[PDB]
Amino acid sequence: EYARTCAQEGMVLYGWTDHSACSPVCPAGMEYRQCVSPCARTCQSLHINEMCQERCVDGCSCPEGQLLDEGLCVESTECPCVH
Amino acid sequence: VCDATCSTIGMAHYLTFDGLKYLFPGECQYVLVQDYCGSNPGTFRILVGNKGCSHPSVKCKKRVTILVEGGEIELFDGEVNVKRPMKDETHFEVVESGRYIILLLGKALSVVWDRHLSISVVLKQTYQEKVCGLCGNFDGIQNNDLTSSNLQVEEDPVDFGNSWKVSSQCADTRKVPLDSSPATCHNNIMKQTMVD
Amino acid sequence: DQRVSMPYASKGLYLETEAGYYKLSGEAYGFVARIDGSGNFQVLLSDRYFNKTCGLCGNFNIFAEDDFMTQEGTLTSDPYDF
Ligand SMILES: *[C@@H]1O[C@H](CO)[C@@H](O)[C@H](O)[C@H]1NC(C)=O
Ligand SMILES: [Ca+2]
């Protein structure tokens, strides 16, 4: 809690969970990042930008590649199609 | 060839350039029309966003964000707002005349807004298949306006506009069962005649 | 009572997931709620209700001592009966 409560005030902290030996729970493929953008570029997404000027929010998210596709992190190569 | 015209007749209906009325109740933000389509520079990115507008009512106040010349001018709630002025101000123009907000943006682009819901963008002879979105491609062919963002024609428009939402994680709309009577006129044959 | 799927956007309330965590946004009504995986309610609320609200999360004023004003309105020292 203390992490977020400071973060809300306008001053965020970084990497504190690295040595704390406690990470908040998240499903497979993701673990807790800090200050990920809400507009997670997913798999079946339109490539538009500079509308998501929202503030930055903490939470768990995929690795660098491994785009989101239906609640899991899957590699960008295997983005399916839909019909 | 003349100057075509999108439209939003009512809350959830859409008329294409080539002319194709179709039904699409949405609640997310959607790409009405743009230029960034396939193999193009992508000058303008007119968007539209409705809220509480799957069922038409006194709700469904629209929001419109139009993205041209690296600017951010948008409108809703009666007035227009400049969030980011664009570079070439010379082409910019606003004509608040009568009931409308006539709004030019260039040589071959113009927007009209009834202050309430309607969005009637007007494009010139310039493009001729250089755009895509919910209004189709502006090619003259009238039965290829449902070419989804994944580059295939779809038969069912409710799946189409789902392909054109911006936030790719919001709620896509629901395939409604087809009938001649909306919710109120459903099994309300009396009212159904008076409305008729 | 009817279990619905997710996401869900009726009546101006977008019920979405963000960063693997569930969100409920009421921006028209000026709030954002969410939950994490472990279960930790959080409410981001707009300054429009400055000095107005009163509930279990206290009033949105500046002070942090007076925000036990009961459903009648009574500054109660106890954080429990409140
Ligand atoms: C809160 O409202 C009360 C009653 O109207 C008023 O007396 C008081 O000055 C207000 N305080 C703040 C911090 O706005
Ligand atoms: Ca066409």
Ligand SMILES: [Ca+2]
């Ligand atoms: Ca307080």
